[PDB]
Amino acid sequence: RFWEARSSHGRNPKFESPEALWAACCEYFEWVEANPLWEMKAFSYQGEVIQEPIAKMRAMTITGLTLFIDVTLETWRTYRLREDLSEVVTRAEQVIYDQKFSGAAADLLNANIIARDLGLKEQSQVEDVTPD
Amino acid sequence: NRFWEARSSHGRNPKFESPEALWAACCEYFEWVEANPLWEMKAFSYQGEVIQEPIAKMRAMTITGLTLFIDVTLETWRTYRLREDLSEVVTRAEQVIYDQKFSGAAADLLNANIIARDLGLKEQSQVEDVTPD
Amino acid sequence: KGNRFWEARSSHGRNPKFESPEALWAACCEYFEWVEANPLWEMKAFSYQGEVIQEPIAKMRAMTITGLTLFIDVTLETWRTYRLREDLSEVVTRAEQVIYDQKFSGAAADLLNANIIARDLGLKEQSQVEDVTPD
Amino acid sequence: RFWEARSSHGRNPKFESPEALWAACCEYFEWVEANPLWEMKAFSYQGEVIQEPIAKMRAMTITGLTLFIDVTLETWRTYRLREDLSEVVTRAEQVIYDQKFSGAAADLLNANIIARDLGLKEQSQVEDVTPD
Amino acid sequence: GNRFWEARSSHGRNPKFESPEALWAACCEYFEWVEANPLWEMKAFSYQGEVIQEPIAKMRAMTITGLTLFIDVTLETWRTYRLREDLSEVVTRAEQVIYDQKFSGAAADLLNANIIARDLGLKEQSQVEDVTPD
Amino acid sequence: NRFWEARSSHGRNPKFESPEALWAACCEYFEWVEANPLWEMKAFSYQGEVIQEPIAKMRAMTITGLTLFIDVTLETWRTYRLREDLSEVVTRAEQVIYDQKFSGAAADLLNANIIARDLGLKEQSQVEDVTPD
Amino acid sequence: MAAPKGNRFWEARSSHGRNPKFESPEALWAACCEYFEWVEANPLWEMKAFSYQGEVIQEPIAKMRAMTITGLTLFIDVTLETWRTYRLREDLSEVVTRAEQVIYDQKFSGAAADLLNANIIARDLGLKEQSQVEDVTPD
Amino acid sequence: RFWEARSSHGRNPKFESPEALWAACCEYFEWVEANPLWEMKAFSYQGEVIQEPIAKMRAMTITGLTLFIDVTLETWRTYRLREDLSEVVTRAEQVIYDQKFSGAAADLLNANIIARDLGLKEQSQVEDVTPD
Amino acid sequence: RFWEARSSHGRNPKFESPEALWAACCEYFEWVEANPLWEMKAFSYQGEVIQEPIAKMRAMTITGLTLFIDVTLETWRTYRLREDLSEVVTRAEQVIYDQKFSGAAADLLNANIIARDLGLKEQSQVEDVTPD
């Protein structure tokens, strides 16, 4: 139940400090690390089937973070305002980006879904070789 | 997989007036999804006999799924946008639905391409014409 | 166990005259039940000590608007008729949502072929292309 | 041999009623289900190889139907012109379409071959984001 | 000889076909030869430190070129059959059999789907919307 | 294997002047190909011991391979098409080569896309611009 | 000595501590090397399952961690602005160029060896697909 | 060490004879076949892990040949000036082409990279079916 | 620590002969061969896990080469143009190209990554077959 997870800062927290905001974000990173998604795998030994869960990496997201610390995207975007907090926001979003990038690069996360999410572009060069 | 029968405790044609009640209803849908995986039949053999076992697959959350479950029309759901308390709940619920599918596809628990299309994740490209003449 | 789907008809019989949303929903639900009770079957082989054994394994049957209408024995023209009366069009919208959702969740779980289903549902690939040709 | 299979209605059949034509079509459908194609697979045990035929779904086709009931495509097409048979042709062609769609959707027939045969379209949206 | 380029019907060298039955009979000989002559994929197995090898049969795709080659008529002569209707119906029938053999084989993944799709001329259909603002 | 050393019984730089002589040489190539598969090394283990064994793989026939084998240049072979007495043999040999590769690719014994390009099998598509107006 | 150390990447920092002020190429390059070593010493981990006699065993398998310029700056604890500022002195600019080249090569070599996802890395490095198209419409 | 391999004609040889030039090319072909690349493959049993190198086909290349016979690509191109040597160059490049084509067709070499190297083209026909 | 590897030619060498430069390039080639990358492979026996490192081919790059011999890319391009060094640069780059091509062809290196790096192009022929 990922939608139930909330930081220790409680309901509708007010952040008037970088240290406090960053710590709440770190609680989210910690929760993601501690709460992988589960893939049910089936095994069998001599006529008996045993179904055991296998951990899969959970991709970090900004909506996941904000839901966790119990604020709206709009409030999160409000933090961008004060430089004090804006620095924390930048760092948290970079962590989210790098988690997904490193996960995808290590084939722990689906590469194309992450490439699309991160906005990694395909670059190409096309030559028209039609004789004139 | 009798999903078309599933309904929240709020029953038929509920009139939501409270954001906590609407959110609780949405949470009932999320709980239902988690408790009701789709099933893949898998077969194994041993000493001359074949054994079949259903294996749990993640069920993708959808807005139409949610609304059917809490028994409102998509039109009713859009009405909630018209007042701030309910609209905040709609946004929260839609973000949960998006993230469930994104994280599921990212972990290859859901088919990545179909989820990418559903979520509107775009392919971005840069193309140079090297024969501009 | 036989895939004679061309023989499957609802209990409502030939050419139902639905005058009721409860009635029409009821008919739609009979179709959904048949689909789930009637998976496709795939033969899988297993070896053991010099002998191979075959076992059929259930595969999800995709719902379709065509299937539903054929099953309840109304024409597509009749199905679109229901739209005329906002009474039945509400039941039609609900059925089509169920059919869409069945195939979407099936495909998402890889129980149905994702590309077949993406084309069927009309899920689009979206792209953004920048021309970076110098100038 | 699939080119040898024929309905109980004999050579160059004439169809006097929709029930007769439908009966012949259903014979084709039933023949298809009773005659899967076979993938040959090998298994090994203690030095010997076993060749195990494994059943693969046979896709229905209109030309297969017409070969089976022993009429040309041209003749089949004339049945649309009979007021007593037209609805049967429609029904038969719809069964053929549905069998392939359901089979492909269930991963029992090759998805791309069926998608092309059925005319299932890919839809896309493209935005030119070149700065002006 | 029994290699594919050597295989021939029981009508022999350069048969001049002037009947539907004789022609259809010849075509069936080809269809039967194709079924009797799958291609072979070698597979290896290990047992107690000795490797063992045996092949599995792979479906041979039917082709119009293969058929004409087998019944020993040129493609030119085959086209000629199109002109007279006696033969024309047999030609159409045979070509439908060839098409369906490959189509069903590919649908069952017993033949390579993309090779067959290109051969049969099965088309990809698409719809594209330019959503560039303006 | 030294495939570049394989040569028909017609010797060095033969000067073909008969269609039966050219066809016989082409047939020696066809047989050589069918008789000389490529070989892939595969590993096998048993209770902690490993053994390797070559497994036979289909060799694709090619016009360049044919000409190398009968020992004429590719350009000489192209010349044969203009020759009244040799042209039919060229056409026939090129058909055998095409047919072998087609059957191999269709049977998944040769790489499908490499063969599709080699044979010139085309992809056909139909595209509708559905941009509203 | 062959299991997850559990070092959280967002916590990782060089021995130079908080907000270091790099005033020599040597100090800077040493810090960059700490990052390169950290990446090597802290792979990502994939959980894999095994079984023997009806018991399910979990075990982590190491997966290569891709180096990134953002990763480096976070590790040595300077902002992107500061990193870009290093370009002002020919002194530090050489270190920056070399560090970025190391990062590029680590990813390329990882991807080429199938240790990192090829397409993810190709997009990251800006490796282009080049094509030549002939219009053969009878004209 | 492939960059150290050299023909028996020594350093920067001068080829005057077509037979000498062909003989050198054949030394290269022989060297390629005697020097496959190796893939390490791991096997395990009862707690022990064993590694085994497996031979992989080495793709012939014109640059590889010229490095081996120790001439520059420029020198190689210069051979075209003499009808004599030009025939040997064509024969050699033809052997190189076929080795890679046949290896790729048999999936002993990566087919798409070989397709690009050989310049095998994708041919398509595209119909604009937009209604008017 | 590949970022610490350096040729016997020391820091920021100023090369004055083709033999010296070629010698330095060969040290790099030798280093690459002696320094494969490692994939951890896991096996299980009796509820215990065995980890085994497996060698993976390291791709040669001009960037790796210049880092190893400790010169800038512009220095390297300067060698391209130097009458006395240009031949050696061509030779070194040809070695690097062929190592990656052969590795990719053998599937020992990722084919698409290498294809992009080598600049191998996809060639196509397109007919527009629209009616009118």
Nearest to residue F129, comparing CAs of E131, H120, B90? E131
Rg, Å, chain G Cα set: 20
Helix H or strand E segment including I12 = none
Q: What's the token pair of residue C34?
A: 């048949």
User: CA C106, A36, B94: angle at the middle one, nearest 5?
Assistant: 55
Q: Are E96 and D63 in contact (CB under 8 A)?
A: yes
The answer to whether A72 and B95 are in contact (CB under 8 A) is no
Question: Degrees (nearest 5) of the Cα angle I114, I117, I121?
Answer: 90
CA distance D44 to E44: 9
> Alpha-carbon distance G139 to G120, whole Å?
41
Amino acid at G42: N
String of DSSP letters for A67-103: HHHT--HHHHHHHTSSHHHHHHHHHHHHHHHHHHHHH
| Bridge partners, F53 (sequence order) | F42
One-letter identity of residue E70: F
Give, in order, the Cα–Cα distances in Å from I58 to each of D30, I7, I55. 58, 17, 9
Instruction: Read off the tokens for B131.
Output: 């024969």
Residue E11, classed as helix, strand or coil, is: coil
| Helical segments of A1-132, H only | 18-34, 62-69, 73-79, 83-105, 111-118
For residue F14, give Cα distances in angstroms to D120, E22, F2, F70, H87: 55, 43, 21, 8, 16
Contact between residue D96 and residue D65 where contact means Cβ atoms under 8 Å apart: yes
Could you tell me which of G124, G120, C133, A125 has the C-alpha nearest to residue I122?
A125
Q: Which domain holds residue A41?
A: 1-132
Residue with the two structure tokens 């890679």 = H100
Count of residues making up chain E: 134
Q: C87 to chain D, minimum CA–CA distance in Å?
A: 29
CB atoms within 10 A of CB H88: 21
Cβ neighbors of G71 (< 8 A, separation 6 or more) are A98, G9, G35, G39
| Alpha carbon distance C61, D105 (integer Å) | 8
For residue F13, how many other CB atoms are within 10 A of its CB? 10
Question: Are D41 and D51 a contacting pair, CB within 8 Å?
Answer: yes
Helical H segments across G15-65, by residue range: 25-41
| Phi, psi dihedral angles at D16 (to 5 degrees) | -85, -15
Task: Give the pairing of strands F49-57 and F38-46.
Answer: antiparallel
Q: What is the DSSP letter of C61?
A: P
Put simply, the answer to whether B125 touches C124 (Cβ < 8 Å) is no
What DSSP element (H or E) covers H5?
Answer: none
User: Which of E38-42's residues contact partners 24+ apart within 8 Å by CB, and which partners?
Assistant: E38/D40, E38/F107, E39/F58, E39/F103, E39/F104, E39/F107, E39/F109, E41/F107, E41/F108, E41/F109, E42/F55, E42/F56, E42/F57
The vertex-A120 CA angle with I64 and A118, nearest 5°, equals 120
Q: In one letter, which amino acid is F63?
A: I
The one-letter amino acid at I26: C
- Alpha carbons D52 and D105: distance in angstroms, whole number: 26
Query: Between C and D, how many residue pairs show a Cβ–Cβ distance under 8 A?
Result: 122
Phi, psi at residue A86, to the nearest 5°? -55, -35
Task: From E17, E30, E104, select the one nearest E70 (Cα to Cα).
Answer: E30
**Cβ neighbours of residue I121 under 8 Å, at least 6 residues apart?**
A127, G130, G131, G132, H116
CA–CA gap between residue A105 and residue G117 (Å, rounded): 5
Read off the amino acid at residue A1.
Answer: R
Mutate to test the interface with E, among D43, D110, D116 (most CBs of E within 10 A): D110
CA-based nearest residue to H122, from F118, F77, C127, E79: F118
**Cβ neighbours of residue C112 under 8 Å, at least 6 residues apart?**
C60, C62, C103, C106, D105, D106, D107
Q: I62 and I96 in contact (C-beta within 8 Å)?
A: yes
Alpha-carbon distance G90 to G101, whole Å? 16
Nearest CB neighbour to A126, from listed G70, G110, G131? G131
Q: List chain C residues with CB under 8 Å of B45.
A: 46-48, 53, 55
What is the rounded distance in angstroms from the CA atom of residue B12 to the CA atom of residue B4? 13
Q: How far is I129 from chain H (nearest CA, A)?
A: 5
Contact I54, I42 (CB under 8 A): no
The two tokens of residue I34 are 């002696």
| Cβ-based burial of H21 (10 A; exposed 0-12, middle 13-18, buried ≥19) | buried
- Residues with Cβ within 8 Å of H45's Cβ and at least 6 positions away in sequence, in order, are F45, F47, F48, I45
Pairing relationship of beta strands A37-44 and H37-45 according to DSSP bridges: unpaired
C-alpha R_g of chain I: 20
In sequence order, the β-bridge partners of residue F39 are F56
Place of tokens 């090779």: E115
Partner-chain contact C47 D52, CB within 8 Å: yes
Which residues does G1 contact at the CB level (< 8 Å), separation at least 6?
Answer: none
CB count within 10 Å of CB C97 equals 18
Phi first, then psi, for residue E54 (nearest 5°) are -150, 145
Token pair in block for residue E76: 């030119």
| Amino acid letter for position B12 | R
In contact, B95 and B89? CB cutoff 8 Å? no
Whether G10 and G71 have beta carbons less than 8 Å apart is answered as no
Whether I111 and H109 lie within 8 Å, measured CB to CB: no
A46: burial class by Cβ within 10 Å (0-12, 13-18, 19+)? exposed
List H51's β-bridge partners, or say none. Answer: H42
When computed from its CA atoms, the radius of gyration of chain E, rounded to whole angstroms, is: 20
Q: Which residues of C53-69 are buried (b: 16+ CB within 10 A; e: fewer)?
A: eebbbbbbbbbbeebbb
At CB < 8 Å, which residues of chain H contact F?
26, 29-30, 33, 41, 43, 45-46, 48, 50, 52, 54-55, 87, 90-91, 94-95, 97-99, 101-108, 111-112, 114-115, 120-131
First to last CA, chain I: 65
Report how far residue C73's alpha carbon sits from residue G16's, in angstroms, rounded to the nearest whole number: 78
Provide the shortest C-alpha distance from residue I72 to chain H (in Å).
24
User: How many angstroms separate the CA atoms of E60 and F35, rounded?
Assistant: 19
- Please name the residues in contact with I30: beta carbons below 8 A apart, sequence gap of 6 or more: H1
Tokens standing for residue E74: 């040129």
H86, H64, H88, H68: which is closest to H13 by C-alpha? H68
G31 class by beta-carbon count within 10 Å (0-12 exposed, 13-18 middle, 19+ buried): buried
CA separation for the pair D5, H18 (Å, rounded): 64
Q: Is C59 helix (H, G, I), strand (E, B) or coil?
A: strand
Which amino acid is located at B118 in the chain? D
Residue E22 CA to residue A84 CA, distance in Å, equals 93
Residue of chain B minimizing CA distance to C133: B128
- Helix and strand numbers (H, E) in chain G are 5, 3
Residue of C130, F4, G81 whose CA lies nearest to B128: C130
Angle, CA of F18, F22 and F24, to the nearest 5°: 115
Which H or E element spans position E56? strand E50-58
Q: Give the Cα separation of B43 and D128 in Å (integer).
A: 49
Q: And the tokens for F50? A: 């490993």
| Distance of alpha carbon D113 from alpha carbon G94, whole angstroms | 56
Whole-number Å distance between alpha carbons of D83 and D80: 7
Number of neighbouring beta carbons within 10 Å of residue A57: 25
Token pair listed for C100 = 């869409």
D87: which 2 tokens? 């609805």
Residues H28-40, buried b or exposed e (16+ Cβ, 10 A)? bbebbbeeebebb
Note whether E72 and F86 are within 8 A (CB): no
Token code pair at residue F10: 């017609």
The answer to whether B16 and B7 have CB atoms below 8 angstroms apart is no
Whether residue E33 contacts residue E72, with contact meaning beta carbons closer than 8 Å, is answered with no
- Residue among D37, D41, D43, D69 with most chain E CBs within 10 A, to mutate: D37
Q: What is the distance between the alpha carbons of residues B91 and B81, in angstroms, rounded to a whole number?
A: 9
Structurally, chain B folds into a number of domains equal to 1
CB G29 within 8 Å of CB G66: no
User: For chain A, which chains pass the contact test of at least 3 CB pairs under 8 Å?
Assistant: B, G
Which chain D positions have a beta carbon within 8 Å of E126's beta carbon? 121-124
Q: How do strand C125-131 and strand D122-128 relate by DSSP bridges? A: parallel
Token pair listed for E107? 């649908």
Element (H, E) at C135: none
Q: Which chains touch G (3 or more CB pairs under 8 A)?
A: A, I
Pairing of strands F123-129, E124-130: parallel
Q: B36 Cβ partners below 8 Å, 6+ apart?
A: B3, B6, B59
Closest CA to C109 of A1, B37, B29, A114: B37
Reduced to 3 states (helix: H, G, I; strand: E, B; else coil), residue C2 is coil
Contacts of D105 (CB under 8 A, 6+ apart): C60, C62, C103, C106, C112, C113, C116, C117, C120
* Type of residue found at B58: M
Which of F36, F111, F124 to probe the H interface (max H CBs under 10 A)?
F111
Using an 8 Å CB-CB cutoff, list chain H residues near F118. Answer: 101, 105, 120
Query: Do H28 and H35 form a contact (C-beta atoms < 8 A)?
Result: no
- Half-sphere exposure at residue A48, Cβ-oriented, CA atoms within 13 angstroms: 9
Q: Which two tokens stand for residue F128?
A: 């509708």
Tell which phi-psi region holds residue G74, choosing left (phi > 0), alpha (psi between -120 and 50) or beta. alpha
Neighbours of H85 (CB within 10 A): 20
Q: What is the 3-state secondary structure (H, E, C) of chain D?
A: CCCCCCCCCCCCCCCCCHHHHHHHHHHHHHHHHHCCEEEEEEEEECCEEEEEEEEECCCCCHHHHHHHCCCCHHHHHHHHHCCCCHHHHHHHHHHHHHHHHHHHHCCCCCHHHHHHHHCCCEEEEEEECCCC
Cα A97–A101–A105 angle (5° rounding)? 175
3-state secondary structure chain B: CCHHHCCCCCCCCCCCCCHHHHHHHHHHHHHHHHHCCEEEEEEEEECCEEEEEEEEECCCCCHHHHHHHCCCCHHHHHHHHHCHHHHHHHHHHHHHHHHHHHHHHHCCCCCHHHHHHHHCCCEEEEEEECCCC
In degrees, to the nearest 5, what angle opens at C-alpha G122 toward C-alphas G118 and G124? 120
Taking contacts as CB-CB distances below 8 angstroms, the residues of chain G near I124 are: 131-134
Taking a C-beta distance cutoff of 8 angstroms, is the pair A62, A76 a contact? yes
Check if the beta carbon of residue G32 is closer than 8 Å to that of residue G95. Answer: yes
Q: State which H helix or E strand residue C72 sits in.
A: helix C65-72
Token pair of G36, please? 């390169």
Which residues of chain H does F3 touch, with a Cβ-Cβ cutoff of 8 Å? 95, 98-99, 102
Of C42, C117, C130, which has the smallest distance from its Cβ to D108's Cβ?
Answer: C42
Contacts of G17 (CB under 8 A, 6+ apart): G77
Distance CA E64, CA E70 (A): 10
CB contact under 8 A, H110 and I108: no
For tokens 């360049």, what's the residue? F64
Resolution number, Å: 1.8
Give the SS3 label for residue A107: coil
Asked whether the beta carbons of D22 and D9 are under 8 A apart, the reply is no
Q: Do chains A and B touch (3 or more CB pairs under 8 A)?
A: yes
- Sequence-ordered alpha helix ranges (H) in F1-129: 19-35, 63-70, 74-80, 87-106, 112-119
CA-to-CA dists, residue E18 to B123, E23, E80, E98, G54, angstroms:
60, 8, 11, 22, 72
Task: Say whether the F–C interface has 3 or more Cβ pairs within 8 Å.
Answer: no
Round to whole Å and give the CA distance between G119 and A113: 12
What CATH number did the domain enclosing G115 receive?
Answer: 1.10.132.80
The answer to whether chain A touches chain H by having 3 or more C-beta pairs less than 8 angstroms apart is: no
Residues 6 or more apart whose Cβ sits within 8 Å of residue F90: F22, F77, F80, F81
Separation between Cα atoms, residue H103 and residue H123, nearest integer Å: 22
CB E57 within 8 A of CB E38: yes
DSSP I40-66: EEEEEETTEEEEEEEEEPPPP-HHHHH
Phi and psi angles of residue D28, each rounded to the nearest 5 degrees, phi first: -65, -50
Distance to chain F for E116, nearest Cα, Å = 7
Query: What is the C-alpha to C-alpha distance for residues C91 and C23, in angstroms, rounded to an integer?
Result: 10
DSSP C7: G
Structure tokens at H17: 């004879």
